Amino acid sequence: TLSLANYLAADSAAEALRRDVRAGLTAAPKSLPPKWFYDAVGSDLFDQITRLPEYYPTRTEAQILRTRSAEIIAAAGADTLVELGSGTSEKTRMLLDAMRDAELLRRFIPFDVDAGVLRSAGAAIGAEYPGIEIDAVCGDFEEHLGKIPHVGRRLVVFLGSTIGNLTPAPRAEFLSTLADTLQPGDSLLLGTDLVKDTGRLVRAYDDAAGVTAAFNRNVLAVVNRELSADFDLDAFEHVAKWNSDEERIEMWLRARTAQHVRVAALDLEVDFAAGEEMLTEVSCKFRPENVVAELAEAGLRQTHWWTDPAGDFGLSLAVRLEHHHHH
Numbered sequence: 001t002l003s004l005a006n007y008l009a010a011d012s013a014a015e016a017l018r019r020d021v022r023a024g025l026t027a028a029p030k031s032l033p034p035k036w037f038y039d040a041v042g043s044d045l046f047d048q049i050t051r052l053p054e055y056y057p058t059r060t061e062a063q064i065l066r067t068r069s070a071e072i073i074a075a076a077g078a079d080t081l082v083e084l085g086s087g088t089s090e091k092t093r094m095l096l097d098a099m100r101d102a103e104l105l106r107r108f109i110p111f112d113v114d115a116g117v118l119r120s121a122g123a124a125i126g127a128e129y130p131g132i133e134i135d136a137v138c139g140d141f142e143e144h145l146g147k148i149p150h151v152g153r154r155l156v157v158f159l160g161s162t163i164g165n166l167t168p169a170p171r172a173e174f175l176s177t178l179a180d181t182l183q184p185g186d187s188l189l190l191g192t193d194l195v196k197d198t199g200r201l202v203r204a205y206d207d208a209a210g211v212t213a214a215f216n217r218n219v220l221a222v223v224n225r226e227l228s229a230d231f232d233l234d235a236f237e238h239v240a241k242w243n244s245d246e247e248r249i250e251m252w253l254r255a256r257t258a259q260h261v262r263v264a265a266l267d268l269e270v271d272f273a274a275g276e277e278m279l280t281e282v283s284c285k286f287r288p289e290n291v292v293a294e295l296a297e298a299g300l301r302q303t304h305w306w307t308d309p310a311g312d313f314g315l316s317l318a319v320r321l322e323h324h325h326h327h
């Protein structure tokens with residue numbers, strides 16, 4: 001059966017956007033938070049990104065998952081799959097199938113922000129695996145992970161290398177609060193894209209076909225629609241840079257010419273000097289030794305580690321770290 005629990009107010013999304021755009025456009029370095037890439041148009045564009053020749057990470061992680069699903073499930077020994085975020089639908093089925101193969105499948109707990117996407121995919125998963133207890137949560141990572149049920153022993157999965165779109169401090173902060181939700185006997189499966197040839201890294205985030213560029217520009221179309229703004233989309237160049245100090249890709253929007261921009265709903269006036277760049281995303285790439293470290297710092301011990309043949313991408317399986325104190 002299905003049980004959906006909706007923790008997002010109707011105006012929670014509207015109000016956070018106002019809040020965010022106002023801070024982003026008035027900061028000395030202008031910026032916009034990546035979460036706003038994912039309206040209907042944006043998210044279809046991202047789905048198209050997962051199929052681009054240059055954009056290896058989705059298909060690499062998918063491929064590892066394919067090989068290791070049986071093994072993950074034997075190691076988790078869980079009857080309950082929690083999926084943090086959705087939009088990794090084919091990957092979900094791999095984990096669900098492997099749980100069924102093992103005669104262990106009992107409960108599915110998707111956790112996303114679109115109640116409609118949840119509501120639908122539940123009827124589809126509920127179709128394919130009859131007899132399953134689906135408990136969808138409409139909630140937000142930074143507030144509502146606590147809302148996720150701790151009944152049974154659970155495999156909690158965070159795929160799509162989303163965790164890389166957070167900078168060190170809020171990334172440590174999210175890993176830690178997430179670690180707190182795990183009961184003894186639960187496991188976290190986490191995906192992390194790895195440091196590699198930087199030319200391949202830059203190309204992955206600025207494809208030949210200009211799709212990423214559209215994806216990037218569309219955040220302005222979002223602001224235009226939702227907050228009555230007049231961003232000239234054609235006036236901003238998509239630029240992807242590799243930051244070797246932070247070992248991350250950064251996406252920017254660079255004004256070709258001097259732009260003056262009005263956000264009417266916010267009664268905000270913004271100016272873009274010619275060539276001025278606006279930060280819209282970072283994508284952090286990990287080193288195998290540091291994943292183990294950031295995990296332990298979060299309160300999690302790696303129990304398993306899997307890479308694709310070319311060492312492009314990592315999957316980790318972790319359990320709550322425990323200590324023996326001395327006084």
Ligand SMILES: N[C@@H](Cc1c[nH]c[nH+]1)C(=O)O
Nearest residue numbers: 049057160161162165283
């Ligand atoms: N999670 C994806 C989001 C993205 C794709 N392209 C640009 N951003 C990544 O950082 O790889």
